[PDB]
Amino acid sequence: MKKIILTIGCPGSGKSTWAREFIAKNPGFYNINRDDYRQSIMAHEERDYTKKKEGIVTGMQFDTAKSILYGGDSVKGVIISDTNLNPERRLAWETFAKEYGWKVEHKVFDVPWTELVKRNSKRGTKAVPIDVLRSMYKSMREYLGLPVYNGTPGKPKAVIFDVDGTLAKMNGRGPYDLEKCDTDVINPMVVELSKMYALMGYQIVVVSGRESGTKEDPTKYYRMTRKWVEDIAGVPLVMQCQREQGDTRKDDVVKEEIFWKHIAPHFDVKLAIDDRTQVVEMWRRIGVECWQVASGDF
Amino acid sequence: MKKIILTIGCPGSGKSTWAREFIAKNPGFYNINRDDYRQSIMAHEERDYTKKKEGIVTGMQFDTAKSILYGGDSVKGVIISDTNLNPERRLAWETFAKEYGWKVEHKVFDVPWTELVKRNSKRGTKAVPIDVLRSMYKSMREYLGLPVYNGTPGKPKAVIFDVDGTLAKMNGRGPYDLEKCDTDVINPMVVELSKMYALMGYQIVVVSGRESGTKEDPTKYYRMTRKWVEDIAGVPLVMQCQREQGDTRKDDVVKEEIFWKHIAPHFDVKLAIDDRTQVVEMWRRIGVECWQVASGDF
Amino acid sequence: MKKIILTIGCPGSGKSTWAREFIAKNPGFYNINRDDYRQSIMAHEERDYTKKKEGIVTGMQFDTAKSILYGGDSVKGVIISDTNLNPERRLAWETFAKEYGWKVEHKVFDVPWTELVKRNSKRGTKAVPIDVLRSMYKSMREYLGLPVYNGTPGKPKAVIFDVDGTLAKMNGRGPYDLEKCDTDVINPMVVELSKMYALMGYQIVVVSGRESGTKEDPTKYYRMTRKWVEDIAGVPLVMQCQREQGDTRKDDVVKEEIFWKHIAPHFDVKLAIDDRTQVVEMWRRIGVECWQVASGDF
Amino acid sequence: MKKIILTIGCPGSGKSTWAREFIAKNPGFYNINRDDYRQSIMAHEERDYTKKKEGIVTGMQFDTAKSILYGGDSVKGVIISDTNLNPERRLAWETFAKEYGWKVEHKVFDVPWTELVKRNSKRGTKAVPIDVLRSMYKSMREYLGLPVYNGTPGKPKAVIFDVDGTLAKMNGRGPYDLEKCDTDVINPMVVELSKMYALMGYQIVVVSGRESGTKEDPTKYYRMTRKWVEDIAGVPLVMQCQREQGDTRKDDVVKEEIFWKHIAPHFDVKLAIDDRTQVVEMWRRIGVECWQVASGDF
């Protein structure tokens, strides 16, 4: 059968680039894009929203697929290089292909949020607002079937606190120089908050993206951080999780893995306090309310 | 009735700009472009030619017109912002509109050749080869019903010779400084050519884009040029035509007007010898064989 | 004297555009840009940081100013179209101009933060990271001599809470439809927070960008909001400030004016809880620690 | 010593690309470009000519070279990525480097005229007018020390005539289908011209870019062409030169090689008649007056 290839991915994920390259290497494939169409019927009005226009672009897409997909044995298929993140539209393509006898394949472009943001900020006039991008990424996560937290019944309620930038600031050292992280001063209001919650009966769970330690001393930083939280901040934590030694992945990935493995099953986490934008974005995205206490664009 | 507006014009004539502006001012109008389509189905392969692809783009255009033109009383019409310089395709749009009951209007963008070339050279990746541009302009002229020469029966055969850059060069003066045009030296081979033709029985007609003269002396330059051709070159001309005093139009326009009014009806012109690119382009375009004797890109 | 015009403004404020336009209208003025230089010596390496390179660009700038500023009576001056937000560099230009006898003028481009961000997100490859942009804006504010809060001694400590998106969410209405703002449901954790602080002895000050009311009923929304906070949330507030009726300025401006006039002189504000990104950015920028409780990119 | 690398090449020859790549691979090298400077002092006025501005850019270049070239052992050299096609300016760089003790190297980018034109037509806003490009190429040829014809004393005078498009047109075949080149019809006026010159005593030399023949019959086309010229056109030629079988180079190169080897030493060639633009450009460039008899943009 002729293929109908739907690209699935948030804007800037590489869908168009792939489409061009693929067509350049496999004769018999054509591209259909709601976007070449959207810009076209408007004579290229800057992207800076009608149900009718969208109805036109939709008609263009299917009518164009039918015509192309009926060429001779020369035509192999069509690529629908849109985000295709709306489930109903994806279904519409499959039921369309079933009645005309064509097969539907998916070409996924799962790019990390941090890469999506980075690329999007350079997209120029094709850049998309952060809120629609975050919305696209949420749909992408639902497509991949990634987990969303909804509480842990029968478990004590808890608040998650990060260390760097949240409970602590930094008294003249420098990001990634943990050897002197014992000099960090307290962020008064946040430190105070953690004590307030404890009094309210919440379990205080501390998390940190600081590497636990070095190759020869795997918990060097985990220990200093623990002493700092105990002796300097005075935070009555029930648990302290931290990036494992050697682990070079993004705080992003590291903290979520830590969450599902070590926190979610033991606590009914009601809140997370953090400062790094990519982490704060991770928390809210997986279902955990998150309060950002300072600028964290790094 | 709903309108189907066909833009008629060579590339770079302003068709897209107008289309955007018009849609921005008149809600209910949509744009259809073989080109948004051509680039789209190929995932934007650089423009640097199949009868099948063109068949697809064509289908897209009509199918898209039908759908749009059938919206409610909200839709006023569609703009077909292509060159639409191929007569058969223009007819195809009119017979298409007649059977579905829509009206066809034309929005012409007649830009002068010299402006087309100028703009095209800056078009970047959308620039078109000079030969296809010259071809587009020829079709545009046929659309406008502009005249093409095919000889003048019963009249003596003649060769047209230009002066500046052709019969004469320039001995240290400067373009537009006719006050010293009497110092020009002969272009030997070309001067010799004119005498050769005379011997062959051709009438030698001299033409010049040099203003005839000044406001107080309207033939100052016409006279010097005539003396130069007689005494210095020794060209046995039967007629000498020249740009009228005060006339500020392009050599382009000036020489063709001169041709139809004063030459075409009295001579069977078989050839024209010239050096300025825009003039040489004019000659060939209206049906007169033209030999360019030197670089004339000014 | 010849002028040395320093443009003062964060990237994207219009410095280059103005410079081009000004030179186009006033012959005798030349442009010097650390940036044409930075890109140039590197053969245009993508902007994606050496003290030596910067030393070169600096030398280029002054050496180029000296040469230009010494032309004849034809030269009027030079424009230094950089951000010029670093005070020491600004001083360096003035002491440079004093010893050579030239005058220094400033051309300020004070664009609102929200406009800077908006423009920056479309800047493409010239876009600047949000953290350096926020840093530029902080220096711009210091240039303008705008106020920075540092506490109010002798006054009771307080926490500022916003309503929309912070204490309340929204149960099926829509932004700007205050007529049904009485249906908003509580944001449990945040509502709880306000009570926690009260117990700790902090004064709870509520702020809202919701227009107080309509032309015929100037406190319609102020009253509903007040009842909602009292009866539904149960927030023990000491004061409630809100956007005045008719006022169409940005929440940005509105809340800061409200802060200086009605809050700062009566309270020692230690914290602000809010959700809208532009407001959260305003709080931190003027010296008030701010916790963002949810995505607020609208 | 520190190096001063001058790039030598017409615009579009790859000078900037090379410069970026080289700097990216060899730390210690900086780029100086009259052009980053020209655009910069004018706040980027579209390129669409003062002796003073040029004086400023010049000062910027040398002053910037001195400063850079005096860094520590870290600096290796500077690249002057301009065309550097003006001999006096090249000399100025060498005498500048001699007095300060630096060495001057050249990095040449000799791109074929046809490639220069091709690239230039796509250059967009950086495209250069054809006449300045042709001027740049002439200087490049003088730099390379390429030959320029100035006549052959003691030898009979001759006119060179091309076949395809000049003496012959084409009666329904197609470029590169020589198997049916025997069907070409005469271009009357041009054929007549060749006879006129013969009567005047000129030697008629015929040249053709048509491959002489095939691998199994190396003169198949040379013979048909010769018969066509003899029996159909009636051209009294003294010599017939033609592209050798197997030779795949551009007509460009092929005809000039043919000229120097077989024509220049036996004839005092006074004129060449041709129709292909790249060939016509070759003729004039090497010193031979050339008349283009029809559009030859292919």
Ligand SMILES: Nc1ncnc2c1ncn2[C@@H]1O[C@H](COP(=O)(O)OP(=O)(O)O)[C@@H](O)[C@H]1O
């Ligand atoms: N692997 C990559 N690394 C760096 N940049 C990339 C990569 N892939 C794509 N980009 C850039 O991101 C932007 C997204 O382009 P595009 O292919 O059209 O994505 P999409 O069609 O999914 O919106 C482009 O400017 C592109 O050059």
Ligand SMILES: Nc1ncnc2c1ncn2[C@@H]1O[C@H](COP(=O)(O)OP(=O)(O)O)[C@@H](O)[C@H]1O
């Ligand atoms: N009146 C004008 N003066 C100068 N430039 C123009 C003018 N009109 C159009 N152009 C330029 O010429 C190019 C042709 O653009 P476009 O509008 O798309 O023409 P077309 O659709 O006919 O090919 C554009 O880069 C445009 O900016």
Ligand SMILES: Nc1ncnc2c1ncn2[C@@H]1O[C@H](COP(=O)(O)OP(=O)(O)O)[C@@H](O)[C@H]1O
């Ligand atoms: N008043 C304005 N309205 C909308 N966009 C603007 C305005 N002024 C400038 N811009 C855009 O913002 C970007 C900033 O350009 P630029 O003039 O170089 O600023 P700067 O030199 O201060 O960094 C440009 O892309 C420009 O077109």
Ligand SMILES: Nc1ncnc2c1ncn2[C@@H]1O[C@H](COP(=O)(O)OP(=O)(O)O)[C@@H](O)[C@H]1O
């Ligand atoms: N080898 C090549 N093949 C195709 N295009 C090229 C090549 N080299 C350069 N170009 C293109 O030609 C233009 C000339 O660019 P540039 O490097 O700045 O040349 P120059 O500095 O000599 O004027 C560019 O748009 C470039 O991408």
